[PDB]
Design a protein around this ligand. Structure first.
Ligand SMILES: O=P(O)(O)OC[C@H](O)[C@H]1O[C@@H](OP(=O)(O)O)[C@@H](O)[C@@H](O)[C@@H]1O
Ligand SMILES: [Mg+2]
Ligand code: NA
Ligand SMILES: [Zn+2]
Length: 183
């Protein structure tokens, strides 16, 4: 039963520019790739869990997302970061694109993507971590019983509510390996 770092994408791995869906607009946050490779060496499985309502909004297609995500996966793999899972949610109750127009339980703060990852990779949840920049991330983590909930300051400016719900607040994902290592 392996421990994991569940990872928000926009604002945590890549600078949030708003509905990022193009390679030219994807900017890794400083030091996160190195930090992810270290996390891995410390024996954590790494699992991306990202809301992509942009798809239900019509801003871009599930297939452009697929294209970006494949590129992202390779860029990481080529840097010795091998992601154990990539989960996403294309939905929004008010979506303008029918096939993604719906309520769901994968859309954080619903824990859908975390539990699914739990089942499919057999993750020790109480020994796992959630890293994101929003309240919905802390709430999603809480529901799924993720032991350690980590807010970061690299994305959405943090709300006091997001901070209420988090266990740690770090400047960045780049800081996580250190934070963990000192217990
Ligand atoms: O789950 P992660 O953060 O990786 O992806 C989701 C994003 O943060 C997106 O949230 C969106 O709105 P929401 O869906 O909250 O109504 C937007 O603010 C996008 O520009 C933003 O990047
Ligand atoms: Mg985010
Ligand atoms: Na949105
Ligand atoms: Zn969903």
């Amino acid at each position: 039963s392996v421990p994991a770092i569940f990872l928000d994408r926009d604002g945590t791995i890549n600078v949030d520019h708003g509905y990022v869906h193009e390679i030219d607009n994807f900017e890794f946050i400083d030091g996160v790739i190195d930090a992810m490779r270290e996390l891995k060496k410390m024996g954590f499985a790494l699992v991306v869990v990202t809301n992509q309502s942009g798809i239900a909004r019509g801003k871009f297609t599930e297939a452009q997302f697929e294209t970006l995500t494949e590129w992202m996966d390779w860029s990481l793999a080529d840097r010795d970061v091998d992601l154990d899972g990539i989960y996403y949610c294309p939905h929004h109750p008010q979506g303008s694109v029918e096939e993604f127009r719906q309520v769901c339980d994968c859309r954080k703060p619903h824990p859908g993507m975390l539990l699914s990852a739990r089942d499919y990779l057999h993750i020790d949840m109480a020994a796992s971590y959630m890293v994101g920049d929003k309240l919905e991330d802390m709430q999603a983590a809480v529901a799924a019983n993720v032991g350690t909930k980590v807010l970061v300051r690299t994305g959405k400016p943090i709300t006091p509510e997001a901070e209420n719900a988090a266990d740690w607040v770090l400047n960045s994902l780049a800081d996580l390996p250190q934070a963990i290592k000192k217990q």
